[model samples]
Target: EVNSFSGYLKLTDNVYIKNADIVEEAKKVKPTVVVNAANVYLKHGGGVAGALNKATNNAMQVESDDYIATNGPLKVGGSCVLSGHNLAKHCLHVVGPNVNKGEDIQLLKSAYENFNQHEVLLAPLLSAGIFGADPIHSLRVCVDTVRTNVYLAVFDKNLYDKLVSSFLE
Candidate 1:
């Protein structure tokens, strides 16, 4: 899956996530969409202190012997990094991947060039089980992967408007 845009996060809410750096943690998970903590500090620190401090910090911290933990169940998923940085101001903690496959390692230059260009080659490839990504998902991928000066175009809202405008009904 790409990312969930079901609802918006409120400024009043603060989420703390531990082991947040998992390949597929929250995104793939259904129900829960947030991770909570309190009294935390930069990088590594755990227990009551870590959770609280993590919530209060300005930027997400990653540290060694990192003591990060979330409030409860979590959702959101991906093959690597879990898009923790892509998400709004949040924190996830972990060291290295199980094996660190190179698929996502070089995604910046490894994407299907034709598909990323918003071309028709995506659907047939998905239909033939070429890369495992579905058709609609491929479309969403292109819009998300490319950078544009269209303000909300490359970010999110623009994609929503683009989809709506192409509606037939």
Candidate 2:
């Protein structure tokens, strides 16, 4: 069982801090679906996207490329869900709000709210991390939006520790 903190759900035994190993954590969680914080361009450049691509042996990129060619760049708050032989049973590639471009929190929330129904979900810090969004803010929105077992695979130890502390407080 878990408790609520400041209107946000606190981390329970179900939630884990896997320390940059989203792939390994996903394996452990065996999530029904996994989500990637993707850009409009659908380029699996670095951070979570790159890690997921590597875990799927470039299959994600291939599928993404094809999807993009057919659909064009992903719009803010838009996503391209794929059912392929990727790291997870399903992959929901979401185009997160580009914080540098003045995108708002609503856009970030859209990404999470788009596919928050799965039993188990593996996601990153949304527009945070490499995308330059605030980790605390992202985590807050995530907890507010998600309604399932969530695993936040943070790569940076400092950020991870900070989030843990923040939740405790």
Candidate 3:
């Protein structure tokens, strides 16, 4: 195994990777629900949020807008579920921690821990991207937090390969 940091983290077969951008690949895998790494305000901006909203023809964004207006901003560890228009049947907007704020890594854990009961779920690297957590750190947390029937749909081979070495029994 001479592939340490070369994007080949294949430690086990339980983990699978596909070259699908979040919502695009998520639908191919066909989960009952999909997750978006969202902001505390629950705005459907760029990255995972924008892509999912785009896929749903902006119907997803409208739903999040309405929900946030009612329940208020999502707490760091909280989640908001929206009616998926054409992607998965439901969309879970998990509020990822802003590690830029020197936020506790444990708070990032809840983005996964809080939604463990979901069946046949598709997820992304939470507390990452603009939220400011390292991809490797987020990948490790996801391995620790994921239960059965969870598909970690990544945007590219960068994370797909990184996650390889992190998969556990």
Candidate 4:
């Protein structure tokens, strides 16, 4: 049996989906990690990246630059750290292929890999936005890949409903 609500459900023991603000979830002290759909360079100029950067007072962007400078560009599901944010202790900077560039599920699948199963995590629907993957497809891959310690955060009302319908019932 699955536990659910109008806009939420527990998919597994530790994973659930919700219509929520990922940035706000990231701000909760209970959730120590947040996944940002980042570019290869880890620029937080727009989308959820921009919002998180603003919320953390630019510390996110600075840490992003320093991380890249030291370790080089992160892989599709690579990571970055945030020390100053009292609540959000870490940020996972995962890169997505621009579907405009002909990338598909296999690549998208990689971006959602290698998360820490022990930490509390907040994530947006991967690649459902400017990255160009259809919401259904993106949501499917995330459901398939991210199974533990994850709160799938979707901001779009329509998309959230689609996910709840497509996956829960």
Q: Rate the local accuracy (lDDT) of all candidates.
A: 0.25, 0.73, 0.69, 0.70
**Which window of ten consecutive residues has the lowest lDDT sum in model 2?**
1-10
Task: State model 1's lDDT.
Answer: 0.25
| lDDT tens digits, residue span 108-164, model 4 | 777766554535567777777887888888767766776567778888888878877
Q: Best lDDT goes to which candidate?
A: 2
lDDT of 3 by residue, 10-62 (tens): 33333334435776665554556788888887777788888888888888877
Off by over 4 Å in 1: 1-128, 148-169
Error of 3 at 14 (Å): 7.1
Q: By descending lDDT, how would the candidates be arranged? A: 2, 4, 3, 1
**Estimated TM-score for each candidate:** 0.17, 0.82, 0.82, 0.84
Clashes of each: 19, 0, 2, 0
Choose 3 or 4, whichever is better by TM-score: 4
The model with the greater TM-score, 2 or 4, is 4
Report lDDT (Cα) of residue 155, candidate 1. Answer: 20
Off by over 4 Å in 3: 1-16, 166-169
Per-residue C-alpha lDDT of model 1 across residues 1-169, encoded as one tens digit per residue: 3323223221111211112222223233221112222111223255322432354352334421133343322211111111133322232221211112222322322232222232111011111012223334433443454332111111234434443344221
Question: How much does candidate 1 score in TM-score?
Answer: 0.17
